[PDB]
Amino acid sequence: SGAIYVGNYRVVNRHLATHNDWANLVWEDSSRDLLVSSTTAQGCDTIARCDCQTGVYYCSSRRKHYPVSFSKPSLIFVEASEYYPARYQSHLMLAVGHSEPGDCGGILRCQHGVVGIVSTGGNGLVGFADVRDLLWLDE
Numbered sequence: 608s609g610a611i612y613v614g615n616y617r618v619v620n621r622h623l624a625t626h627n628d629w630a631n632l633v634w635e636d637s638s639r640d641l642l643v644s645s646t647t648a649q650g651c652d653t654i655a656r657c658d659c660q661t662g663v664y665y666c667s668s669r670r671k672h673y674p675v676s677f678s679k680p681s682l683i684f685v686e687a688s689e690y691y692p693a694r695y696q697s698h699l700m701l702a703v704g705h706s707e708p709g710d711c712g713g714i715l716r717c718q719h720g721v722v723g724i725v726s727t728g729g730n731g732l733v734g735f736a737d738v739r740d741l742l743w744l745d746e
């Protein structure tokens with residue numbers, strides 16, 4: 608679990624979105640595993656606007672942060688899941704690193720701010736859904 612709080616928006620994994628997230632829906636993209644809902648309180652997270660390929664992510668299954676190198680956002684095999692079936696996540700970045708399913712929602716950050724959230728992985732990989740292209744989150 609986990610979310611990004613920026614302005615009057617809450618960014619979560621679409622597969623973990625709650626009833627309240629869907630009742631206050633702003634945008635969702637099944638192909639990206641993202642959902643953005645509106646909030647009453649103002650969030651103070653900063654979204655990164657960059658092309659960094661290195662950062663640090665939080666891994667709840669180890670209670671640890673790990674530094675990683677990750678690929679640029681691209682279309683990639685997501686193993687047909689319970690929430691979804693086979694298809695290629697768009698805007699997904701991969702790194703070598705530990706992850707388990709509840710790891711989804713952990714934040715990946717670079718020196719510029721939030722880059723994305725854990726969204727795929729397995730067999731020694733970890734996938735992050737990029738949010739740097741969502742320029743509207745800042746307004």
Ligand SMILES: CSc1ccccc1CC(=O)N1CC[C@@H]2[C@H](C1)[C@H]2C(N)=O
Pocket residue numbers: 622639640685688689690691696706707708709710711725726727728729730
């Ligand atoms: C960190 S995910 C993971 C980690 C180790 C082992 C297995 C997984 C896979 C997993 O259970 N997933 C959650 C639901 C859907 C795909 C990934 C998500 C998507 N974005 O399509």
Ligand SMILES: [Zn+2]
Pocket residue numbers: 655656657658659717718719720
């Ligand atoms: Zn950066």
